[PDB]
C-alpha cells in the first residue's frame, strides 16, 4: 500500500514539474522573440 | 524490493528536476527583469 501511495504522490510531483517546465518554455520563448523583435 | 528501490531512485531524480526547474525560474526571472529595467 505504501508503494501505491508513493507512486500516486510521485505522479502529482511529475504533474507539477510538467507545469513548471511549460511555464518556463513559454517565458524563454517570449524573451527570445522579444530580442529577435528588437 | 526492486520496486521500492526504483521509487527511492525516482524520488532522487524528481528532487534533481525540482532543483533544475528552480534554477531556471530564477534565471528567466532575472533576464525578464533585466529587459524591463533596460
Amino acid at each position: 500500500n505504501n508503494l501505491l501511495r508513493a507512486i500516486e504522490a510521485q505522479q502529482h510531483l511529475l504533474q507539477l514539474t510538467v507545469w513548471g517546465i511549460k511555464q518556463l518554455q513559454a517565458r524563454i520563448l517570449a524573451v527570445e522573440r522579444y530580442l529577435k523583435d528588437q | 524490493n526492486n520496486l521500492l528501490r526504483a521509487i527511492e531512485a525516482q524520488q532522487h531524480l524528481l528532487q534533481l528536476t525540482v532543483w533544475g526547474i528552480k534554477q531556471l525560474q530564477a534565471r528567466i526571472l532575472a533576464v525578464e527583469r533585466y529587459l524591463k529595467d533596460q
Binding site: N2, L3, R5, A6, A9, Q10, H12, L13, L16, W19, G20 | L4, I7, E8, Q11, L14, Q15, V18, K22, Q25
Partner: peptide, 23 residues
C-alpha cells in the same frame, strides 16, 4: 513540491511559484 516530497519520504521509510514550492 515540499508537501508531496515529505509524504513520499515517510511512505518509503515505512497556480503560482510560491504554491508550486509548497505542494
Amino acid at each position: 513540491x515540499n508537501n508531496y516530497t515529505s509524504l513520499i519520504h515517510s511512505l518509503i521509510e515505512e497556480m503560482t511559484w510560491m504554491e508550486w514550492d509548497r505542494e
